[PDB]
Symmetry: D2
Subunit: 297 residues, 4 copies
Amino acid sequence: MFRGSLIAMITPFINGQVDEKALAGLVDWQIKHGAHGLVPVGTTGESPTLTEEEHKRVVALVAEQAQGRVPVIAGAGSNNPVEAVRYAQHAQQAGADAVLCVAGYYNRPSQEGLYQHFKMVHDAIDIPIIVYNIPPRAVVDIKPETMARLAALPRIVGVKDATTDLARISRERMLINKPFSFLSGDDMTAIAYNASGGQGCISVSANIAPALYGQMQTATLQGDFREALRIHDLLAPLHEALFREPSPAGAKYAASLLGLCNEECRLPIVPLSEQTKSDIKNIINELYRLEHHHHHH
Amino acid sequence: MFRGSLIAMITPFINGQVDEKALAGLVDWQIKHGAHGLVPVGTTGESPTLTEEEHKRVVALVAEQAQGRVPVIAGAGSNNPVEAVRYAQHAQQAGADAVLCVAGYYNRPSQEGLYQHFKMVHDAIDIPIIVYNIPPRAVVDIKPETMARLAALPRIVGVKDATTDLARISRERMLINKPFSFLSGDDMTAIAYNASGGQGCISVSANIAPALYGQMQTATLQGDFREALRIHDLLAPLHEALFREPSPAGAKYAASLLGLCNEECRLPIVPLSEQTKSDIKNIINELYR
Amino acid sequence: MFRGSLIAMITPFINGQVDEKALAGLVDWQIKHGAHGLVPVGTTGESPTLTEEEHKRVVALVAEQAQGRVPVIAGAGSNNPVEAVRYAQHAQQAGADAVLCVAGYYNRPSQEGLYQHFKMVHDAIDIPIIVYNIPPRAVVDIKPETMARLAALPRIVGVKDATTDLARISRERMLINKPFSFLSGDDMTAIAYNASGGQGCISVSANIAPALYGQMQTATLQGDFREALRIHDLLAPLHEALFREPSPAGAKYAASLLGLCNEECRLPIVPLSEQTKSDIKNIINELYR
Amino acid sequence: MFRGSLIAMITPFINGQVDEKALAGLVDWQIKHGAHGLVPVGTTGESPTLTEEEHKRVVALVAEQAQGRVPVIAGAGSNNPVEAVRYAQHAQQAGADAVLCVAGYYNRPSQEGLYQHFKMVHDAIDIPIIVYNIPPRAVVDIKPETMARLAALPRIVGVKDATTDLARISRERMLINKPFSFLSGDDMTAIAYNASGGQGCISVSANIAPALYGQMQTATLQGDFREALRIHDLLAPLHEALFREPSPAGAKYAASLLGLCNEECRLPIVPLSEQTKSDIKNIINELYR
Ligand SMILES: [Mg+2]
């Protein structure tokens, strides 16, 4: 249902507020340069530090600006399913095509608790859900048997797998007996994931290099792993630099270098070191040098 | 203070809302039966599933009913320091003695980001802060050098250490040169922690056995570690059973057996299995008889 | 130098002694049914419980019986480099083509200690080395910068990567600038590894299904990851059953069902449960055929 | 029945050999200066890089030189129980009072495999066994129910708990009813462990500060935890410096500063950095006047 390069969108700020002009421009620029889909207001979009009003406004503005050109999968994460229901219902009303749902961070519930959280969101809306499995941030882990129970629900349609355990997709595929949108939640292993049955990635780096990242994803989907790895290798220095300090500090700074938005993030995300800024700048300049050298029409 | 048996209070519910009557009764009962302090709307009080209004209401009701009889340390946790500031400012207005602050869960910031979060809360209020270090739930870990930097601020006055790493207190004590309220965040190792320089515990089990838990804590503070271990040995089965399934399901059920509140918690906390319920019932029967 | 499906050979026993008859038969059968190389006396071959002399005699037999038909990479693991040198020197004299070397388990040395271990083995022999990186068993982890230092040595020619960290190969590849045999040490992620730049796997499950595993590896080297994944899906139940209890108990039992050897392993590897045996038997029947 | 400060002895080397003269002198010096027991040829004694001949000779020499003044608990660790049996049998014939046994590193057996390993050693000797639980090095973890199963054997008499999980002793004490020597395997948390029911520590730091370490242990055993913590605070910098780089590099160098032996260890243990040497030198100077 949802395939390829799906961008975990940054949220631009100006004078302490959502930068609506920059956000609209970002949607247009990302679509122009090869986004296969957009995922506003996940943690890369600073969902934890947006107000409930800002969260909904960003989703609404992205859905409006996309104009149906690519799918929009709205973040509806919370550790409280009552809150997640509110985000998901709004997303549906604002014209999002699906929602992305993490559960259980900090309160650390059982598998049954995770299941009931997701069932609550599922039963409250009419659009599809991608469940978000990210033990490295949430501690809790949606286990394969739980994933299979979730897959029995008609509108749980995929997973953003940020476990970094590449055996996990195999364990899930052994238990899930319907088509399922397996999506990587880790840029560094996106190729490994698609070779293992994945069909895309909800990506941070695609904010910055949407054209290359789209080409890489399409190559994996067309079975051309030689071409995909070639592009992955080009992007590896960028990946390292974008994640060296806690994301989205890196992506926000990189986007500022491209003239897309201000570099600012909200606490507890902090400004980059001068060394990290320098490394990002040099990497971006090199990618542009290479593109200009190789381009011809 | 802050010292001894500090109760990580459960939040009672009734028909989907905060049970204000049970909450007032719980404050009275816990104080009557030996609480050294009360810590409303932490993790155990289901801070994640309370609305902002409910969080503030629970803090206000607990401070009101406590009537200054014991210290009240209000939860002011969030992964957004803007929100944490709102809880902490309300807590001060409501008469809390201090706030307990976790930071950085899920967004997973750097040491500098954690520092800036706590500094923002610190600068917005006049009451002190106990920082809450709980990597097993938050992933982020306030490292010893960061704790020392925090301790340089006048109103960062202690830590709830839920790392479960009993070497950590030693590493922090090596770097902190002012009096500091080192508090355990783990009931099972409360004695170990105080023997290593700790001066209390923000405790889940104390909801249910406040008298015995208070006696245990006081024994450690008076240097009678033989007596402390004797009581620990009585409480260890309770500790295990209250954490067998994800807390606070266990504490809420246990309190319901004591007639203190309804057993219900909010999703994603779920009802206990019949086995866990039975084991808790047996433990309560043994303790209160 | 090494590509495709390489088998981490089991070592068969009878009355607890090495069954040389079964071992020679296993070499012939595995080569007949599609092995690309043989890797005797790793942990799958129970290196930890073979005496030094048994280890050497097993390597010699496999090298001789292989008769140059496929490469033989002899295990020369130890946490003592002096012992590893003895294994590697014997392997060379016995006609092994290369050695597979783990280091640092239990004693848990630094990166420099690991480097010096491998350099000692390297400098003592004339045949090449595959470095074995397996933090899940050894705790120590050869970091990418250390791997690059190792690759600078002329006869370090590849790695068996059992980190299960699929980002690791990218990090090593960026730093290594000569032909280098990147080999998976994890059956479940073998396809992922090859998609990421790997060129084969030193496999446990290939002991039992060498023909299908050979076909899966071939597909990845052809660039047909769709066919590779279809084969992986056929082998999925087998992988799970072979690793349900601590390996090599599973592989040894499966090989016994094929008539190749007894199921016996040496303590602390223990007999399988009847459920695991039943599941493996069913899987073998489904595959064969 | 084993209590207090039990030294995880370093093994001194000279010209690539066991330094017998230094070893005898070390036994005498450590006993003179307050050792409550001696534990030769564990990993601090570089058991992984000693030959079988050296392992046995070091045990024999330490038992001989101790002359029954303090208990001698010989290392008989291996991931192969057949090898462990040989070490333990020799230890007994050499006059050791007990053996210390780790199992299962690298091969990573099941709980049943660990049990069978220990049972095999148990049944082969007449002297008692202290089980060595060290997941940080061995990965395998002897779980509380397995420890209880081991405790049902008559000559399994204690544990060296190097889990660094201070809840573990509580979980074990909840299951074990017979007299049992609970011993810490972690210097930094030795006080915490004894406050939780432990009765000693098999200690690395006690190699270097036996007098202070013995005083600290005795203080815990007498219930004087204030005194124990005072001494712990004096020793904490030493604990940190001795484990900064992979042990026993730190302990061997510190002992060399005291004139007890040469600083050398065997690969993969490597020489200390100048910074670490300087820090150890400053700590030694501070302690010894
Ligand atoms: Mg092709």
